[PDB]
Every structure is written in structure tokens, then in C-alpha cells.
Amino acid sequence: ASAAEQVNKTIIGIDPGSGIMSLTDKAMKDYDLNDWTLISASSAAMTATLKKSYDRKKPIIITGWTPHWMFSRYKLKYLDDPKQSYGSAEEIHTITRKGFSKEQPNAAKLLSQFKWTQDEMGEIMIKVEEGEKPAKVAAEYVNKHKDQIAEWTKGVQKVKGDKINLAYVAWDSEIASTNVIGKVLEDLGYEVTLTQVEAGPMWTAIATGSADASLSAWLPNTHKAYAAKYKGKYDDIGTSMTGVKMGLVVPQYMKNVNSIEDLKK
Numbered sequence: 398a399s400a401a402e403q404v405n406k407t408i409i410g411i412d413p414g415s416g417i418m419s420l421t422d423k424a425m426k427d428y429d430l431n432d433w434t435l436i437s438a439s440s441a442a443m444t445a446t447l448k449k450s451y452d453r454k455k456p457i458i459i460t461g462w463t464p465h466w467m468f469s470r471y472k473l474k475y476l477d478d479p480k481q482s483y484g485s486a487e488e489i490h491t492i493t494r495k496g497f498s499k500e501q502p503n504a505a506k507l508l509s510q511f512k513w514t515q516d517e518m519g520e521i522m523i524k525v526e527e528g529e530k531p532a533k534v535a536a537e538y539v540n541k542h543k544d545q546i547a548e549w550t551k552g553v554q555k556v557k558g559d560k561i562n563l564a565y566v567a568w569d570s571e572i573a574s575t576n577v578i579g580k581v582l583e584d585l586g587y588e589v590t591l592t593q594v595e596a597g598p599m600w601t602a603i604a605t606g607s608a609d610a611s612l613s614a615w616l617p618n619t620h621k622a623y624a625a626k627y628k629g630k631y632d633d634i635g636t637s638m639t640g641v642k643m644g645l646v647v648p649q650y651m652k653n654v655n656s657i658e659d660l661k662k
């Protein structure tokens with residue numbers, strides 16, 4: 398039976414303002430999936446549905462990305478994207494309000510040097526998903542990764558309670574990044590605020606300056622329209638991760654579903 402029959406031509410998505418959802422809308426146009434439906438939801442509802450479907454070995458298609466804990470807990474695959482609708486060579490960037498590195502060159506320089514791998518981010522995501530509190534897990538991380546933190550803080554000095562406001566979107570990945578770097582800041586002496594906001598407001602907050610920095614930029618593909626819209630109005634000072642991926646994801650037990658093209662059948 399055909400992917401469209403298996404899932405009733407429905408794809409499970411996340412928050413409507415995210416670029417993955419925008420990129421999935423493009424792919425549906427690109428591959429002529431014109432009678433298909435994309436359900437808007439959220440990160441937590443998407444994985445709850447995946448879990449419910451997977452536990453019953455029922456077919457599902459989700460808007461998925463890596464780094465994500467769901468790939469270590471379940472056997473998943475990306476559908477081949479021959480048209481490259483989701484693009485290529487995606488990274489995760491560290492952005493700030495414009496001229497933030499002129500005010501607090503010490504904080505900027507740290508953010509600039511923050512980087513890490515998928516497996517590493519995953520250590521945090523797994524525990525957070527298991528119900529542990531992200532500040533607590535972030536503490537465990539920074540102790541356990543002594544050699545790494547040192548790399549981040551090469552040339553970085555303590556402080557006297559200097560305020561820094563980190564905006565972030567509650568994707569599982571960005572929860573981890575923000576909390577980890579959150580900790581490394583609070584140890585350096587900063588008074589740290591974390592402001593949760595949705596995807597567009599996150600960018601609007603950096604570009605207007607209602608927040609200082611964010612670890613939540615996925616570039617150049619995922620957040621292309623937000624970057625374009627606010628070109629000139631923020632600084633891009635870091636790449637925390639490369640090789641990251643986004644697209645349509647299915648459980649491996651859907652053996653006959655392997656490409657977005659299979660959804661046309």
C-alpha cells in the first residue's frame with residue numbers, strides 16, 4: 398500500500414512559525430503533493446503522536462530534524478529529498494542584537510566560541526525529555542565536560558552580575574543549547590534571563606534589541622525569510638553546530654516509503 402493510503406495524505410508538523418513548517422510547505426508544492434495536509438502543532442505534541450503511532454507500529458510522517466533525541470530513542474529515517482526542497486549544508490548560529498559585541502565584548506567572545514556536536518547536545522536532550530529540569534541537567538553537563546568548557550572560555554573573564562537576556566524558542570535542541578550556555582554564563586558571574594518566545598518573535602526580539610542574544614538561529618535555509626527580513630539589524634557571531642538536517646521523517650518499519658517522491662504514488 399502507498400504512503401498516501403498509509404497515512405491518509407497527512408503529515409504531522411510542529412509550531413506554525415518555524416522554518417521547517419515553511420520549508421515543508423515548499424516541498425509539498427515542489428513535489429506536487431497538492432491534495433496533502435500539513436497539521437500545525439508544536440514540538441511536544443508532534444513527538445507524543447509519534448510515540449503513540451510508533452508503539453502501535455502505525456505509519457506516520459513528521460516534520461523532523463537532527464539533532465533530536467527522537468532519533469536515538471526510535472528507529473527513524475529521512476525520506477530522500479532529490480529536489481533539495483529542504484536545501485543543503487545547514488548550520489546553527491549564534492546571533493545578537495546589533496553592536497552587542499561593542500557593549501559586552503566579554504560575553505560576545507564567549508558566545509562566539511560556543512560550539513558542540515549532536516551527540517553532546519543529545520546528552521542534555523535525553524535527560525530533559527525524561528523529565529529532569531533543564532537547569533539541573535545543564536549543570537551536570539558543564540561539570541562532566543571540563544576540557545570543553547575551557548575551550549569556550551579561552552580569553553573569557555568573570556564578571557560582577559552583568560545582565561544578559563537570552564531569547565530562545567522551545568524546540569528540544571534549543572532548550573539544551575540555551576540552558577548549557579545559560580549555565581556557563583551564570584558561573585562566569587552574569588545575571589541570566591531566558592525569555593521564551595515563538596520563532597518570529599525570537600527574531601524580532603534580537604533585531605529590535607528587546608533581547609541580547611540567541612542560540613536558536615538555523616541558517617541559511619531554515620530561517621532564510623527571517624534573516625532576509627532583518628538583514629543589517631543583528632549580528633551573526635558564531636556557528637555552534639554544522640551538518641544539521643531537516644525534512645520528512647518516517648519510522649524505518651515503513652520499508653516501502655523512502656523518498657518524498659513515494660508520496661506522489
Ligand SMILES: C[As+](C)(C)CC(=O)[O-]
Binds near residue numbers: 417570620
Ligand atoms: C529545524 As528547528 C524545529 C530546531 C528551527 C525551525 O525554525 O524550524
